[PDB]
């Protein structure tokens, strides 16, 4: 029940439906398999980067 008058309202009219994903033009895959499969790893005191 609303009485006579003028009221401000929040936006219930429109909500987004679609999505717009934009990522850079990169196709190569990171070499996780080769890195995690290396036959030798550094000592903890000589950790690499």
């Amino acid at each position: 029940e609303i009485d006579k008058g003028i009221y401000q309202t929040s936006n219930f009219r429109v909500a987004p439906s679609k999505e717009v994903v934009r990522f850079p033009n990169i196709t190569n895959l990171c070499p996780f398999g080769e890195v995690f499969n290396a036959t030798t790893f550094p000592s903890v005191y000589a950790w690499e980067r």
Binding site: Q8, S10, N11, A15, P16
Partner: protein
Amino acid sequence: SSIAYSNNTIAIPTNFSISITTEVMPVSMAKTSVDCNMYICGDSTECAN
């Protein structure tokens, strides 16, 4: 200022002048309005929930 008090003397004006003075009075302030979601959240559905 030097004011001399006398028991038998009175000072009376002999001329007059018209003085126009200004008085500035605020009467109203800007009417502001705020929105719940657009401020607290913006356009995020999860934040609205």
